Structure formats: structure tokens, C-alpha cells
Design a binder for these strands. Sequence first.
RNA 1: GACGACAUUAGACGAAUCAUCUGGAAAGAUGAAUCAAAGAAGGUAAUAAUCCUGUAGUCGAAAAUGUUGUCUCUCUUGAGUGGAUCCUGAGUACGACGGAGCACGUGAAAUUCCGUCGGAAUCUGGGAGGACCAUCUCCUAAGGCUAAAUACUCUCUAGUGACCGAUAGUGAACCAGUACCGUGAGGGAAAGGUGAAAAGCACCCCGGAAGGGGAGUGAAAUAGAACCUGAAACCGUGUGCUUACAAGUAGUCAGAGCCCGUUAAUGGGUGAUGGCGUGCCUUUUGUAGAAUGAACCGGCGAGUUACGAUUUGAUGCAAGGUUAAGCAGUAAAUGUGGAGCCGUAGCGAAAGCGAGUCUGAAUAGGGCGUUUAGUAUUUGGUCGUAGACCCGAAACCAGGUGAUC
RNA 2: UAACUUGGGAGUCAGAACAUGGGUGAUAAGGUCCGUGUUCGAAAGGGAAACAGCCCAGACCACCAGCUAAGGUCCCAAAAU
RNA 3: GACAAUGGUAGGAGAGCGUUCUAAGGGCGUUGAAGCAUGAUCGUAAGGACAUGUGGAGCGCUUAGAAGUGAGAAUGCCGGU
Lengths: 131, 199, 60, 116
Amino acid sequence: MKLHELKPAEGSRKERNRVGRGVATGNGKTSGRGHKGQKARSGGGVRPGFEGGQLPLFRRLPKRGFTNINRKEYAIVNLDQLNKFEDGTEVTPALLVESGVVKNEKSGIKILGNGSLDKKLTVKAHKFSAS
Amino acid sequence: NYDVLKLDGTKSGSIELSDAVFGIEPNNSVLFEAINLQRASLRQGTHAVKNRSAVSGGGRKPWKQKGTGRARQGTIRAPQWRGGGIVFGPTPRSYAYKMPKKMRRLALRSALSFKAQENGLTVVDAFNFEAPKTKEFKNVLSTLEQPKKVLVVTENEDVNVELSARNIPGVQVTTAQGLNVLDITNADSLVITEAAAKK
Amino acid sequence: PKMKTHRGAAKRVKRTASGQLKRSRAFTSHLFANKSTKQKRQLRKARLVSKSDMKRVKQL
Amino acid sequence: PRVKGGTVTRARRKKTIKLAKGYFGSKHTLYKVAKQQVMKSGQYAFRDRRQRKRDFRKLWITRINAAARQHEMSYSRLMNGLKKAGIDINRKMLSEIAISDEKAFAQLVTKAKDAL
RNA sequence: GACGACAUUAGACGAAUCAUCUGGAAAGAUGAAUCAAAGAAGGUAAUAAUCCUGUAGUCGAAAAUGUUGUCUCUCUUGAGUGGAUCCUGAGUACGACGGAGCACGUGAAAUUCCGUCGGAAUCUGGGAGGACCAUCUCCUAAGGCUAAAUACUCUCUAGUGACCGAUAGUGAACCAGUACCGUGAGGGAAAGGUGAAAAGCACCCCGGAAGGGGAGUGAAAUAGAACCUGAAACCGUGUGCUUACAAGUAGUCAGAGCCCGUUAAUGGGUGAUGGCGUGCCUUUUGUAGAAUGAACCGGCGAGUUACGAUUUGAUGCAAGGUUAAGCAGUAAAUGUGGAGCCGUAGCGAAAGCGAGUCUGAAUAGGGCGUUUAGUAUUUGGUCGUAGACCCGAAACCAGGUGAUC
RNA sequence: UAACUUGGGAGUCAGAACAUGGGUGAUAAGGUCCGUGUUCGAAAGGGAAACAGCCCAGACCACCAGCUAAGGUCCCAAAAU
RNA sequence: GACAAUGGUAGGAGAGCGUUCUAAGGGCGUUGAAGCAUGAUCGUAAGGACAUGUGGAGCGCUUAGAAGUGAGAAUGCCGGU
Ligand SMILES: [Mg+2]
Ligand SMILES: [Mg+2]
Ligand SMILES: [Mg+2]
Ligand SMILES: [Mg+2]
Ligand SMILES: [Mg+2]
Ligand SMILES: [Mg+2]
Ligand SMILES: [O]
Ligand SMILES: [O]
């Protein structure tokens, strides 16, 4: 490129469709005929004139919790945890480990909360722990 | 790979150049969108226009609605009427968008490859002086349009901008529009490793 | 502005590119049929997800 | 950057009006009227080409029958005489023949009359 | 209240070129030369780094102002222990009643304020911790002051524009809030350009004058003041062809006669005569339509923009991806900046459990989830919020102007 | 040779005539209301004197070529007194 | 080289022309720019060159970017006739 040679990609640009022009543009009226192409141009969000969108309230939502990490890692060997956010999670409100196809490599562990299948594996590997 | 540093017209010891900066096999698409990202940013939005609202004018109905024999009109200021407003006028904007951190680096490295693709030169400059003598320096033949890449702050060569066609940054910011205009660049031996390592 | 969610979202809850429901008729006149009175399941408005969106998308 | 829309309009309108040379009254000076009259013209051409083909087929047939009434061979006896003879040509050559030379036409009718 | 430095209100210096052709005139072409901390810009008889103003840089203030500094200048005790006894803001806080406001509509409705009315305590005290009691934790009203960070620009200085260039842009480029209209509040215009220089037509002639023909100024006066360029409508003068038995949405097709010669090719101008043929848009079940709009022509003039969602295409990364504000930086892509956001595991109203959960007596049966590709930026399509394709109402409300009819 | 799913985008909700089975109406309506099918609407051209819907037939452009469809062959007006 | 399709309003999809400006490159211009006028020319279209006259100083071209981007009709505004 010396700024007199440029040729960008294929499918990075297009026409813009100016409307209010032409007759042979494929436009000229652009919506209906007297119908409701007026300026406001709304049926009003979502509404047909009646009330099929009204169903019961089946709810509550208080505070909540944990993240996830599967047991599927083969990154570390013996490098017990809460050190890390690199090859696991970035954020932690409350940490928790789970299943996800087995870890045959033997590491310890350092965790809040624990899954059951995870427990019975990591005990058959090096360690189980709960803090 | 390697280039031959030199001094005023005499060869000197070779050097090493990363395959990843000056062998990055440039990418046109990235380079395109990069440059448009720059050339858009300089564009400031200082234009303006008056709609039918801000315009000093009227809501007075000049003639009443009906009984006339002429049309029905509400103001003497509207896009029709001479002196009226200008509907869907242009108004200021940011004229600036973003690209990721990495596509930038890929761009810089791409263009810098586009030089070494053909030829990009190197020198050791310690000339602390202030003059047009730096034009006689071009016995290296270093064709017209150029940057002259120094380390951070120099206050000697940068006052010599006044030549008809060149540039002279520090490496702290070297930009792919400052580059891609000129076809012949040069650089310092001290600093080429910086840009190479800094990417 | 950010776009405002329709706070009739308590009525419709997400799974995986879709919505979940409690069916409609309940909570007055429970005289009527036993089989009509087993109605705790899914509902949905399949084609009207086209209709009932870009107002409730933060939760979908 | 506002755009003075001038500098094209007039030129377009000249490229119309200068296809109005020979039209009557204010039809050869004014854009509007000459626009719409032009459009009528182009359409009329688009039916007139078809129309000339129809026409000259009529004309050639007329002249030809005007020839073969001389031997009182009405036009249809003849043509059927020609498809049976194992020969065939266009019209317009029967015309030009039977106009510029009579004898040739006579020999055609002999060649056809005897196949009936 | 004394006494120094810096900036501001006038300014100065400020490097460098000659010729030939064209020209009315060179700053252009042609050549050979020069300065650069100055090739920014504008003017100069046509397009100039080297002709002028100028810029880079440097210098400069008697007086006045403004901000800063050091001695004057003022003004000042600062902690600790012990806690016998006293003090820690009264018609207050709080409650009820009606109300407002707190994102919060009287709701279970805290916390804060208003009015009426009642009406506490004194550190072993009192208030809060979203009705209310308890334990725990934190804080101490009912008295007052407080720079910066921030929001705006009537105005000035210096600058800038993928801003306008006379129906645009301030309404206003000019003697404009003028002329004008109206009792009055108030509303509101149109109108730029000679040439390089006024050198702005001496003088003769007709003419009452105006105006003109001549002569001259000037490169050009068909640039001569209503003065650059000067289109179309419209109006004329002359002329090649044609037209006075003729029924015409006006053309097209065919075509003789008469004339002419091109951006030189199946030529151009006219057109006796015949065939064929009921305008344009809009709206409409359908319109030649006797349904609507347009007198002609010139100009003007209607899907835009931000923010956000969504999908489509591209592009970079990849089980990873990405920065926000802010800081430095040429009002700049370019570096920093890992709070935050998405995804990676879901189901259940929720506690919760977790590749299974929920429902359920059930391990049955079924709904959902399984089996990895996602994500940041962006062109386009669409939507929503903001007047949001344009023009168009009677009407409503607050404020004020008029009883000279 | 089309059919289905998903995703993006709309338009349309006033239909008319002809034939046909029917209701209503008076075995009236260029009527109205339904089913059935076509054409017009969004489709010119040839015929129906003339004509939105009837009849034949679906225009990419040009030719001074031909054969046919409906309907026609004395002049108008091409073609058999 | 064959084979087939190519009427079309609402409307959906696609490729395209020209204007103003910018950036870069390369070019024209008193030995007469732009605009204007005339013309029997090129291109499938929108459109563009060329010759000549007038005109008296700035303009094109290729690549790409952003647009106040196109006007025959509003009982449309203005101006002239
Ligand atoms: Mg109360
Ligand atoms: Mg009170
Ligand atoms: Mg003008
Ligand atoms: Mg139209
Ligand atoms: Mg009607
Ligand atoms: Mg008009
Ligand atoms: O209005
Ligand atoms: O309006």
C-alpha cells in the first residue's frame, strides 16, 4: 500500500439503500399505500389490540451463589489452588468444583464446596478438601 | 532476517531482525481498516445546521386555514420556505471507533514488513546539530519521503522538520499512515531492537 | 440509552434460546375437570418469539 | 458538505428537449411536455416495427393478386400451386418480379398452374 | 500591612535569485543558483520558500493590572493520668392525623421533611442496621463554616474545520432587527461582485433632453456604471421548406418532391399523402375520464444521527476474548489501565443439587440440560428510545398586550 | 421438478366481472352473500365495430422471412363473388 | 460450443453510473480553465469524450473514504415571464 493502490475485501462493504429516490431503485413509496407508512410507524411495541400476552406470575429471586470449575484439568500436577485464575475461572463470588471428564493426574485440592463424583475421584487421586 | 547497518556511506556490522516483525507477511485487510481508523479520527465533526426549531422564526400562521384559495401552511419557516430549516441535517459526532489491541500490532508489523519486503535501511545517528546539512546526509539516496526514527526525546533533529518532504518520530509512537506514504524509511540501530522487541 | 426490559419478565423465564411458562387457567373456579386440572407443564408461543422479543432479551 | 444540485439538471433536460425537434407549439421547448411526448414516441416505435411487418406483408400480397387476376388465378390457387410444386420463396420477390419483369412471373404461374 | 520573580495590556529584529519565450502584465515553461529553528498563510497586473507583509527563533514595558515568592507581619502552650462530683444542644426526638419527598403510588414501609396535637431519656443513656422485640456490631442529632475535582460562555486573546460560499450560512456578508405591517404586545423583508489600476468616454455629430453613432483610455467597453460570466421561459427581425375541400393528445411508421453537405455515415432540414393511435401522476374493483393537482420555466426541497438490542458478511484471537473512565500523548490509532462484561453447566419459583436436575412414594415415567465455539470491532438490513420519512389542523395550558371601534 | 425446517425482511386484510352449484331477493338487477375455476388486478398484442375482466395467446432486443391459433375471405379491410 | 429461462405493480435480493469534498499518486492550464452554446459521435441504460464559438482562472483522471448526494407534480416557498 502506497495509498493509491487500495483494494479492500469481498463482503466488507455494500450499497447503502437510500430511499425516497428513484422509481426503478426498487423504491419510491417503500411501504404500503395509505396504509400505515405514516411517520410514527408503530404498532406500539408489541400489541394486537387484545391480551394474549398475559400469564401468571410464578416467581421470587433472592441472593444466590457458586461458580463452576470442572474436574477436567490436565494443566497442573501438584499445585493446590486458590492461587489461580489463569487456566480456570476469572471471577469468584463463591468457588465450587464439579465433574467433567476425569482427571487422572494426581493433584491435591483447595476449594470451597465439592461435588460428589469429584470427591470420589480426587480421593482416589491425591486429596479431597473443603476450604 | 539480517541487514547491514552503516554510517554516512560506509558499511558496518550486520544485525538481527525478528522473523515475527519484519517477516510477518503483511495483511492488507487489517492495514486497510487500520488506516481508515486513523484517517477518520483526525476528522472532527465541526459542522452544524439549523432545524425548524432552533431557527429564529415563526409559529404564526400567516394566513388562516381555509377560505383562501391557497394551500395550508403553519409557518413561514419550514424546509420548503426560503430561509427555513434544513430537515435531516448533519450534526456533530464522534467520528471515531475502535479496534482491538492486537490488530493494531498486526498492522504496524505488517507495514513494517512491507518495507523490508523491498528495502528498509538503518543507520547510527548521534548528530546533535541543527541545520539543513541533514539533506546532504542523503548520499545514501534514501528517496524523498521518509521518517527518521530516533529514540525518545531528541531536540536537535526535530527542529529540522522544515524540509519539503519527510518526518521524524520517536519510536514511542510510529503509525501506519506516517509509514505507508513514502516507500523509503530508515531507523536507528539502538532503537530497531526496541521496536522489534516492543513490537 | 440502554434498552429497557419489559418487566413482564417475571411471567416468562429462560432456558436455552427459548422461554418457559406456567399455563394459563388457574386460581378461581377450581370446580372443573380433574384432567383439565393437571396442567403444570411447558407452554410457549413458537412463532411469536419473533413477535415477543427485542423487548425481553437481557433475559434471553 | 451541501451539494448545489445544479450543473446537471439543465444538461439532462437538454438531452431530452433535443429529441424534440419538429414538434408543435410549446412541445419542442418545454421539458415536461416533451418528456411525456417522447415517451409516447418510443412506445409508438415499439408497436410500429411490428406494424410495418404486418403492413408490407399485406401490400406484397395485394400486388401479387393484382398480377394473377390477369390469368384469373385468384391468390390462393396460386400459393397452393407453389407448395405442391416443391418450390417456395418469400413474398416481396413475387412482388419485385411481377413489377419489374412480367414474363418471369408468367413462367412461374405456368410452373404452378400445371400442378393443379 | 511591607518587599522580589513571572504573565498580560503598545512593539522591533527577523536568511535567501538572476535571465530567455509568451504576455497588456509573470510569480508559469525553460535553464542554471540560494536559506531553512523560517516550504504556515495572504497580497503582489497570471499559480512565488528567495518582491512585500509575514512565520521559526530571539528581544522588549515608563506606567498599570494580575498571580506567585521571603522578611517583615500578626497570632498562638502542648500532652498524660485519675474519673468521687457535674456537663455533653427540649416543648426538641418520637407517636397519631393529613401530605410531600426518598427509584418506593400507603403498601408490611423503614430512613427524611411540612402543618395541627400530644409528648421522652441524661452514659448502667440514645439512634440505626428496610414492619416490630432480643443479642451482636457500628455511630452520638436537636448549632455553624469550608478551597479543589465539576456545570456554562454575553465577552476577549490565539488557533482549527473531509463546515456554508449569497433562495445556503446569523434573519442580518451590502447603512437590518432597518424599510414595512399593526393602536400594541409583536412579526418581518428583498438587495454582494466593473477593471489590474478610475485610466469613469476629451472632442465632433443628431437631439430640448435622455439616448445614441463616431473619436479615444484600456489586452477586451457585446466590461461603460441597471457595469465578470449571462442559460430557459418569453418576445422579435429575416430567411431554406411548406400551408387556404379541411376533422387533427398532434406523434410514430412508410414515403415522393425541394434544398444542403457532417464529430463524413445505411447523412441532415422540411414533409404532399396513407396506415396506426383517447395526455402525466395520485387514488382506485376499475379512470381518455366529465374525480383530483400542476399556467410555463429557473432554484429550493422528504428515511438522517447518537445510544442500545438483533442478525448477516468480513476481520483478529480461541476455551478463551475484551477493555471502561482516567494518566502521558500533535484536539491525534497507542502505550498504559484487569474494577467490570460475555462464555466455559444446567435444572429448580427458592433453600439447593450439579451432567444430572425437577416433578414426584418411586430408582418408574416424562419437561428442560448433555453431546463445546464462543467473543471484541465493524460495513449493510431491521427494531426501540429521542419530534425520528416531510408538510398539514380545530384545539389545550402558563404568561402578558388592548375598552382611541 | 419441486416439498419441508430454521433464520433475516416486507407487502396485503375495500376486491370486480364471466361460467358454475346454491341461499336471499320477484326462477329482477352491471345486485348481495358463500363454494368452485379462470382472466383482469400486477399482462400488452389478434378478434369482440368501439371497450379492464368474454374468446386465441403469455412480448429479452432487431429483420421489408415463413407456418398457424381464435375469427374471417364483395368494397371499406389482406384473403374463395 | 450446446441446453433452458428472461411481462410485471406492492415488495425482497444483486450489480452498477454521475455530483461535492477529502487523502495519496500522477497530470492539464493565458500558446486560454470552469461553465455556457452548437453538433450528423461512443456506451445496453443511468452517462461520457471530441471539434468549434463565447468565456478570462483554476480544473480534471485512477484507487479508496464521508455525504445536507439526485426533483415534473405537495390547492408546495421564492423569482422572473
Ligand atoms: Mg403519615
Ligand atoms: Mg410535627
Ligand atoms: Mg449567484
Ligand atoms: Mg412519481
Ligand atoms: Mg369507487
Ligand atoms: Mg416547478
Ligand atoms: O403543526
Ligand atoms: O405539521
